[PDB]
Each structure stands twice: as structure tokens, then as C-alpha cells.
Amino acid sequence: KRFSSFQAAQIRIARPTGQLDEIIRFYEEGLCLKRIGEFSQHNGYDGVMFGLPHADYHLEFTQYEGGSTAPVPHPDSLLVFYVPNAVELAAITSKLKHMGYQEVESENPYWSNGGVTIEDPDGWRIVFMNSKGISGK
Amino acid sequence: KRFSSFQAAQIRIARPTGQLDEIIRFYEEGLCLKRIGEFSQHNGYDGVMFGLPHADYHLEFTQYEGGSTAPVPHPDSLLVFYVPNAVELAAITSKLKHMGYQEVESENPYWSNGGVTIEDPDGWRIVFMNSKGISGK
Fold first, then answer.
1. What distances in angstroms separate CA A52 from CA A69, A77, B6, B68, B104, one per listed residue?
2. Fewest 10 Å CB contacts: which of A77, B52, B65, B117?
């Protein structure tokens, strides 16, 4: 995690929600991401942090006491997990659908080729692609 | 990157945009993130991938030929960079403001304590927090 312009100790993707319990069920019970942090009533906010898989890179979800909304869902706004082992991919996506989460048709037919898209409680597109990603070279 | 439910080879945060050139100026020229991939005219889409800082965790921005919009900006939707070295933090945020990007007042006064929020071309809140993040323990 040494960037060109600076040294980053950690990186966090923070998103708002109006249903933090639903979010927890999907991410903790569904994906089985480890809860690496949480806070109750801080400046009117409640939140939880999930490892991705650890603290270096993690997710944070927050809900405001006076009502909060999640980002407006965009079908092209994704969180992609490159899972080269097709058996594990099938297992996780199957568990999520059996828990009640919808598999949707990706906007780009590309992610449809060897990929499965499941919407999280707030419509964020969680993609599981059967590959190793990009080489970057 | 060994998750409980599966082995992830890579992780990608993909977001849509209607101004991919502006996005490139901010991320490549501004943040100086390395371009680890790109594609022209694939299923009507154009896109670019930026390391965070490498391929294991990276960002992808896509624009559709037939017009595309970026996610609806939410003031609580963040990308947080934990930069413990206050001098580097000051340097990067200063470069971005001098390039023309706006520093905004975070929703949560929390990120206001030792943190600087700059909006990217499409309103995503890029936060630079002067800390090491969460321990996770």
C-alpha cells in the first residue's frame, strides 16, 4: 500500500444506509466478512466496519439517527470479487440466494460471462467473477 | 486476501461516469494512481482501471457510448485514505485544490477532525484522514 503521492496506512469504502441490520445480515451472515469495528450513537450515527478481508482494506456502513438513505442504486456501480475457484464462487452465491438475495442480470453482458451479480440490501451490485482479475502489466 | 467464504484473487470497485477524461485527470494526474488497465469500445463501453495502489485492490471507471451518468452523489458515500504523515496529506490535498477540485465540509463532523474531504469530478467524497485507521482488534 505505497502510493506514488503518499503512504496509505489503510483504505475505507464508506456507504450510508437506512437499514444497518439488513446490511449486517448480508455482509456478516451472508458474505461472512469479519466485523472489525462498530460504533453506537456517535454524532447521531451508528456504524459497522467489515474486513475486506482485513483492516487494510475494509467497508464501513453508517446510519443516521434522524433517518438516512443509501446511495441511489446504479446498475453500473459494482463491488467485484474475483473468485478463480468456481466451486467456492457457486457456494457463496448459492448461500446468498437461499438467504433471500436476488441475482440480477448485469448491465454489461461482460460480467454475465462467467460472473454472478447479487444485489445487497440497498441495491449495490456485488459481482463474483470466475477469474483472477487483471494482470496490471 | 483470504476471506472466510472464499479465496479472492482481486477486488474491484467499479463506478460509472459521463466524463471519463475528467475522472482520469483527477485520479491519474491528481492522485497519481497508476493506470493498470483500460479498454476502448467494448460492448459500447470505454473504461480505465487505477491501482489502489496495485491490482489486488483497484478502481474501475466506465462510460457508455450512448450516454452514461455517474452515481447520484451522497455526502456520506466516501473513499477514505488514511495518511498518517500530515506533510504528505497536506501536499496531496493541496495539489488537488490547486488543480481545481473543491474541498468540502464533511457531513459527519468526525471526518472534519484531522481530515480533508475533496470531491472527485462526479461528487464522490475523497477523504484524507490523518491517522492509521482502525486496529480491527
1. 23, 18, 12, 29, 28
2. B65
**Separation CA B99–CA B26 (nearest Å):** 9
**Mutation site for B-interface testing, chosen from A52, A76, A83, A105 by largest number of B Cβ within 10 Å:** A76
Domain boundaries, chain B: 1-137
- Nearest CA to CA, how far is A31 from chain B (Å)? 7
B131/A78 Cβ within 8 A: no
Q: Does domain A1-137 have CATH number 3.10.180.10?
A: yes
B23 three-state secondary structure: helix
Resolution in A: 2.0
Separation in Å, CA of A53 to nearest CA in chain B: 5
Minimal C-alpha gap between B123 and chain A (Å): 12
What is the three-class DSSP state of A83? coil
The nearest alpha carbon in chain A to B83 belongs to: A8
Q: Which of B17, B121, B122, B24 is nearest to B69 (CA)?
A: B17
d(CA A54, CA A76): 26
CA nearest A15: which of A75, A66, A78?
Answer: A78
- Kindly report whether the peptide bond that precedes residue B73 is cis, defined as omega within 30 degrees of 0: no
- Give B74-88 as a 3 state SS string: CCCCEEEEECCCHHH
How many whole angstroms separate alpha carbon B37 and alpha carbon B50? 7
Task: Tell me the C-alpha distance between B19 and A107, whole Å.
Answer: 19
